[PDB]
C-alpha cells in the first residue's frame, strides 16, 4: 500500500497507523507527501493506492475512472455522519471514505467582543462603536469568492442546481434576488466605509492576529497561527443574514481507492479498520489538527473544543462543495463579479448578471471541450490500408529489398552516407571529416563493441505483409528496401520506463552507473532507418486506444485483438538541398542572435515569457526587439523561422503521412497563427556536444522531433541518443532525425567527449503548448496583427522609462504591463479560447493518437 497526502497534513501520525497496520497483518504501509498533488495525481493515475484530498476533486477523478468504487457495510456507514457520504458519491456510487469536515467560522477577539453578533445587518453598528477605539468590526479576505460566499447564498443562491444525485449544469443560481440581497449588503459595507474593498487574504489575517479588528472569517487551517498571537479567540456561528444562516461552502477531507490498484480489499480493510478509528484519527490529530472529522465517536471527542463544534456547525448550515469540474467556471465569474461590484466597476446587479450568463456558458463549453477531446483520442487516419493495397506494397517492398541487396553485393557493404553501416557492431565512438564548407561527414568507425541483441519485448518484424500493414494503417513510408520495423509490447514498455527513470534517480540525476548498465544492453542502430509501433493488448496502461474503433484484418495472427500505434522513427536524411537549408538558417539565426540561453540550452521560435513584463508578443525578447531595431526588414527573422520549421517538417512529412494528420487535429484555428508555419513546431532548441540525463518530457505535443548535424572535423566518443525502454541507441551521421512520442517514451543523450574541432549539434522542433495556449488567448484579446504594435508601444514606454528614471522605474512600468496581460489572459482562458487541444483530465496532450485495432477472427 502506498498512500498519497498533502504536505501540510499529519502524515506521519498517518504512518504510525500504517505502523499498527504492518503489526497485525504482513502488509507495510508507505506514506508519501508528493508535491503538486492537486494535478500530480489525475496525471498518473490515468496511466499511489490511496489519496487523499478534498471531496470536490473526486467527482472529476471519478468521471475519468481513477477511483475505486467502495462497498462499505450499512453497519460501518452508521459510524459516519451522512451529509460526508454524500460528499463522496459521484453518479449514485461510492467513490471515497469521509476522513475529516472543514468549513469557514466566525473568528472573534474575546477582549475586543465579548458577545459577537448574531446577525451580519448589526455589524455596521459595531463598527461605529469599534471605530471610536481606532479598530475594526470585521476584515476578511474579499478577493476570494470562497470567502465572501457564505453571505451572497443566505438568502438564496447557490453554485449548480442540485436534483436526483446530479448537478445540473445548465441552472446557475447566481442571479436570483437572494443573492443580489447577499452581495448588496457586502458592498454597502465597504461604500460606508467598514469594510476595505482591497482587504485580502494577508491584511486580514495581520490585523486580526495584531488586535486591529475584532472579527476575521476563517478556516480550520488558520488556528495555529492565532495560537502564537497574544489575541483571546473563539470561533463561532457565522452572522445571519435576512434571519437566514451563512451558507459557507464544506470540504470534506477524503481517501479515494486507485481503480488501478491490485489491493482494493487490503485498503478497505486499512481505512475502514485501522484510520477510521479514534485511535487512527487521534493519532493523525496529535501530528496535526484535523478540525471537525466525519467519525461520529471520535467528532464528539473532539467537539468538546468549541472551536470545533463550531466548524461543524457551520458545515451543517452550509452547503457541500460540488464534486464537478464546472466549478472553475463558477469560481471565475463570480470572483470577477465580486471584484467589479466591489470597486464599483459594476452594479451588484449588472455583476451577478454576467456572472450568471458568464458561468453557465464557460460550463457549457467544458461539456463540450470534453466531448471533442474524445473524438480527437479516437481519430482515424485517412483510410488507405486494405488487403490488395498492402499485398500490392509488400511486393514493391519486396522489389526494394532485392535491390538494396544487390546494392549492398556490388559495394561490398552498407552505407549510411559515407559511414560504413555493420549492425553487428556497436558504434561507441565515429570519426568525421570536414573536406569542404558543407556539413561534416561520419566515415568511420572507430570504437566498438558487439551488439547486444534486442530485449525480449522488442521484435524485428519481418514479413514484408505485415511491413505493409502498419505501413498503410499508420502513415509511415520509410525508405522502400532501405528500413526495419520493429513491434514493442506497450506492457513492457511501461515498465522499462519506469526502470529508465528509477535509473537515472538512483545515478542521481545524471548518466552514471545504473544508466550505463541499461546502455550496455542497448543495440546500436547507429545508419539505420527505423520505425518502433507499440502494441495495445485488448482489456477485454500508459496507451489510451479506443477499441470501438473500426478494425483491420492483419496478415499476422499476433495483431489480433491489439492497437498498434508509432511511437518513434530514425530518419537519415540524403546530404541535399534541405539539409543546406535547414543547416543555413541555424547559422543564420545563431550569427544574428536570435538563440535565447535558458535553464545550458538555446532556444527560439514563438515563445511567450511570462516572466519578462514587457512581453506582449510571439517570440523571445531578441526577436521582439530585431522586429523594431532592424534598418532593412522587420520580420527577417520570422521568415527565418518558418523556412528553418517548414523544411525539417516537410522532409519528416514526407516518410511520416500521420504528422499532418496530427498538425491537422490538435492546433485550433487560434493556435494557427503561433506556430511556426503550417507545423506542429512552436519552439526550436539548439545544444553543442552536450549530453542530457534520461527523462521523459511532459508539456510537450504528441510526436517531438529531434536533429543533428555536425561542423568540424574530429573523433566523437559517447553521446548517443539511446531509447532504454525500447532497447536501442543510435549515433546521430550526416543528418539524423528522431521522431518520437516525448512524453510517452523515456530518452536521453549520453555525455561526449571529442578529439579535434569536431561540433555535434543537436536540435528540437517541438510544441511547448503553454506558449500557444497564451498567445491564442492574448490573440484573441488584442487581436493577432495588433501584438506587433503593442509589443513596439510596450518597448518604448519601458525604454523610456529606463531612459529617464532608472532601471527600478522601468521595472515598475514592465510590471504594470505583466498584470495587465495577465489579466487579459486569464479572461480568454476562461471563455475557454485554447491554442490546442488538450486533455481536460490531465491539462496534457493525449499520449498517443491514430490507433489501429486488428482482429483476425476465423
Ligand atoms: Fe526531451
Not at 210 to 217: D, H, L, V
Not at 392 to 415: N, V, Y
Not at 637 to 643: A, G, I, M, T
Request: charged residues 20%; glycine residues 8%; neutral net charge.
Amino acid at each position: 500500500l502506498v498512500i498519497w497526502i498533502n504536505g501540510d497534513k499529519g502524515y506521519n501520525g498517518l504512518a504510525e497507523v500504517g505502523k499498527k497496520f504492518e503489526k497485525d497483518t504482513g502488509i507495510k504501509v508507505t506514506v508519501e507527501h508528493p508535491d503538486k498533488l492537486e494535478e500530480k495525481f489525475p496525471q498518473v493515475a490515468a496511466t499511489p493506492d490511496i489519496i487523499f484530498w478534498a471531496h470536490d476533486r473526486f467527482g472529476g477523478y471519478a468521471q475519468s475512472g481513477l477511483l475505486a468504487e467502495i462497498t462499505p457495510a450499512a453497519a460501518f456507514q452508521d459510524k459516519l455522519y451522512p451529509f460526508t457520504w454524500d460528499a463522496v458519491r459521484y453518479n449514485g456510487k461510492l467513490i471515497a471514505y469521509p476522513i475529516a469536515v472543514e468549513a469557514l467560522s466566525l473568528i472573534y477577539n474575546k477582549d475586543l467582543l465579548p458577545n459577537p453578533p448574531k446577525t451580519w445587518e448589526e455589524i455596521p453598528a459595531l463598527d461605529k462603536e469599534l471605530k471610536a477605539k481606532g479598530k475594526s468590526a470585521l476584515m476578511f479576505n474579499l478577493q476570494e469568492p470562497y470567502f465572501t460566499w457564505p453571505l451572497i447564498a443566505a438568502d438564496g443562491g447557490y453554485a449548480f442546481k442540485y436534483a436526483a444525485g446530479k448537478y445540473d449544469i445548465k441552472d446557475v443560481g447566481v442571479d436570483n434576488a437572494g443573492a443580489k440581497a447577499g452581495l448588496t449588503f457586502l458592498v454597502d459595507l465597504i461604500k460606508n466605509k467598514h469594510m476595505n474593498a482591497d482587504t485580502d487574504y494577508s491584511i486580514a489575517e495581520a490585523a486580526f492576529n495584531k488586535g486591529e479588528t475584532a472579527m476575521t472569517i476563517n478556516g480550520p487551517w488558520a488556528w495555529s497561527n492565532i495560537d502564537t498571537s497574544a489575541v483571546n479567540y473563539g470561533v463561532t456561528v457565522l452572522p445571519t443574514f435576512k434571519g437566514q444562516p451563512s451558507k459557507p461552502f464544506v470540504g470534506v477531507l477524503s481517501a479515494g481507492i486507485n481503480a488501478a490498484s491490485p489491493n482494493k480489499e487490503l485498503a478497505k480493510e486499512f481505512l475502514e479498520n485501522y484510520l477510521l478509528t479514534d485511535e487512527g484519527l487521534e493519532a493523525v490529530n496529535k501530528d496535526k489538527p484535523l478540525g471537525a472529522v466525519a467519525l461520529k465517536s471520535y467528532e464528539e471527542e473532539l467537539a468538546k473544543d468549541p472551536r470545533i463544534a463550531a466548524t461543524m456547525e457551520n458545515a451543517q448550515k452550509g452547503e457541500i462543495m460540488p464534486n464537478i469540474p464546472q466549478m472553475s467556471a463558477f469560481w471565475y465569474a463570480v470572483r470577477t463579479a465580486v471584484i467589479n461590484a466591489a470597486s464599483g466597476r459594476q452594479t451588484v446587479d449588472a455583476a451577478l448578471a454576467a456572472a450568471q450568463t458568464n458561468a453557465a456558458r464557460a460550463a457549457a463549453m467544458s461539456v463540450a471541450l470534453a466531448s471533442e477531446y474524445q473524438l480527437v483520442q479516437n481519430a482515424q487516419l485517412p483510410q488507405r490500408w486494405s488487403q490488395s493495397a498492402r499485398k500490392s506494397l509488400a511486393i514493391l517492398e519486396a522489389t526494394a529489398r532485392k535491390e538494396a541487396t544487390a546494392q549492398m553485393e556490388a559495394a561490398g557493404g552498407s552505407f549510411c552516407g559515407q559511414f560504413p553501416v555493420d549492425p553487428a557492431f556497436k558504434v561507441l565512438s565515429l570519426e568525421y571529416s570536414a573536406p569542404n564548407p558543407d556539413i561534416a561527414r561520419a566515415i568511420r568507425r572507430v570504437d566498438s563493441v558487439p551488439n547486444p541483441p534486442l530485449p525480449s519485448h522488442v521484435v524485428a518484424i519481418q514479413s514484408t505483409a505485415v511491413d505493409a500493414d502498419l505501413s498503410l494503417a499508420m502513415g509511415v513510408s520509410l525508405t522502400p528496401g532501405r528500413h526495419t520495423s520493429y513491434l514493442v509490447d506497450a506492457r513492457a514498455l511501461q515498465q522499462s520506463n519506469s526502470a529508465a527513470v528509477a535509473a537515472r534517480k538512483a545515478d542521481g540525476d545524471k548518466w552514471g552507473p545504473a544508466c550505463d548498465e541499461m546502455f550496455r544492453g542497448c543495440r546500436c542502430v547507429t545508419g539505420q532507418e527505423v520505425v518502433f509501433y507499440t502494441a495495445v493488448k485488448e482489456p477485454a496502461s500508459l496507451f489510451k486506444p479506443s477499441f470501438d474503433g473500426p478494425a483491420f484484418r492483419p496478415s499476422w495472427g499476433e495483431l489480433s485483438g491489439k492497437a498498434t500505434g508509432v511511437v518513434a522513427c530514425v530518419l537519415q536524411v540524403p546530404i541535399g538541398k534541405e539539409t543546406d537549408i535547414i543547416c543555413a538558417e541555424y547559422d543564420n539565426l545563431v550569427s544574428k542572435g536570435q538563440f535565447a540561453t535558458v535553464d545550458t540550452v538555446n532556444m527560439t521560435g514563438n515563445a511567450l515569457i511570462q516572466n519578462d513584463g514587457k512581453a506582449i508578443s510571439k517570440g523571445y525578447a531578441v526577436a521582439h526587439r530585431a522586429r523594431v531595431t532592424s534598418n532593412v526588414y522587420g520580420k527577417a527573422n520570422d521568415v527565418s523561422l518558418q523556412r528553418l520549421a517548414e523544411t525539417v517538417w516537410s522532409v519528416v512529412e514526407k516518410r511520416l503521412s500521420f504528422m499532418p494528420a496530427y498538425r491537422d487535429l490538435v492546433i485550433t484555428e487560434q493556435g494557427k497563427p503561433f506556430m511556426l508555419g503550417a507545423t506542429a513546431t512552436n519552439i526550436i532548441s539548439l545544444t553543442e556536444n552536450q549530453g542530457v540525463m534520461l527523462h521523459l518530457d511532459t508539456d510537450d505535443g504528441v510526436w517531438t522531433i529531434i536533429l543533428w548535424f555536425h561542423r568540424h572535423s574530429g573523433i566523437i566518443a559517447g553521446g548517443e541518443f539511446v531509447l532504454p525502454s525500447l532497447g536501442i541507441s543510435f549515433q546521430p551521421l550526416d543528418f539524423t532525425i528522431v521522431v518520437f512520442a516525448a512524453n510517452t517514451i523515456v530518452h536521453g543523450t549520453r555525455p561526449l567527449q571529442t578529439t579535434g574541432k569536431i561540433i555535434r549539434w543537436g536540435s528540437s522542433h517541438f510544441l511547448r503548448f503553454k506558449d500557444v495556449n497564451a498567445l491564442a488567448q492574448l490573440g484573441a484579446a488584442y487581436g493577432v496583427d495588433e501584438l506587433d504594435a503593442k509589443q513596439r508601444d510596450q518597448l518604448e514606454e519601458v525604454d523610456a522609462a529606463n531612459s529617464k528614471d532608472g532601471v527600478g522605474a522601468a521595472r515598475r512600468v514592465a510590471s504594470c504591463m505583466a498584470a495587465e496581460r495577465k489579466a487579459a489572459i486569464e479572461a480568454q482562458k476562461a471563455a475557454c479560447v485554447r491554442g490546442v487541444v488538450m486533455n481536460p483530465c490531465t491539462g496534457r496532450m493525449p499520449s498517443l493518437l491514430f490507433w489501429q485495432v486488428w482482429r483476425k477472427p476465423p
